[PDB]
Design brief:
Coagulation Factor XIII, Chain A, domain 1; four-stranded antiparallel beta sheet; 2 helices; binds ligand 8SL; PDED_dom; cytoplasm; cell projection; vision
């Protein structure tokens, strides 16, 4: 199919170079250079348990893309033992072909949170990579709170 092939081109030319998370203070809480967007494998991350007590977290995402995108955006879900507890939407917008970009996002928490000791290893963050309405990939990170 025609859309399938375009999605595979975009995936092929895409790379997450690095990321970090700060208290919205700022204070780096987590950082990494592993490309967590790679689909098909379950990635793992260890975050400080005190992140659960932040009102907001500031994220920085550095990525490269050989393909042009008209509307790059993410849909991200927290899954707890298979169950979706919370969802976020983030839009970056237009991406220049063969560009490298730094993206800043403010992530806010919504209800009361289970303890870190209950959550740890039982939380999966699922990220869906879209160009407008075309799904380019799905990736997963399992979280441990340390
Ligand atoms: C296709 O574009 C991308 C870009 C980035 C990703 C990276 S995954 C990711 N992004 N934000 C968060 C945190 C928030 C809960 C949403 N996480 C998960 C996470 C949580 C803790 C430590 C490291 C990663 C995947 C695909």
């Amino acid at each position: 199919s025609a859309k399938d092939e375009r999605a595979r081109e975009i995936l092929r030319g895409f790379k997450l170079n690095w990321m970090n998370l700060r208290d919205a203070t700022g204070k780096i809480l987590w950082q990494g250079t592993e490309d967590l967007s790679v689909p098909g494998v379950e990635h793992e991350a260890r975050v400080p348990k005190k992140i659960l007590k932040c009102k907001a977290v500031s994220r920085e995402l550095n990525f490269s893309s050989t393909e042009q995108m008209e509307k790059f955006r993410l849909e991200q879900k927290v899954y707890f033992k298979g169950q979706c507890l919370e969802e976020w939407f983030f839009e970056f917008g237009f991406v220049i072909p063969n560009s490298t970009n730094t993206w800043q996002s403010l992530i806010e928490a919504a209800s009361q949170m289970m303890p870190a000791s209950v959550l740890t290893g039982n939380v999966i963050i699922e990220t869906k990579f879209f160009d407008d309405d075309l799904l380019v990939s799905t990736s997963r990170v399992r979280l441990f709170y340390v």
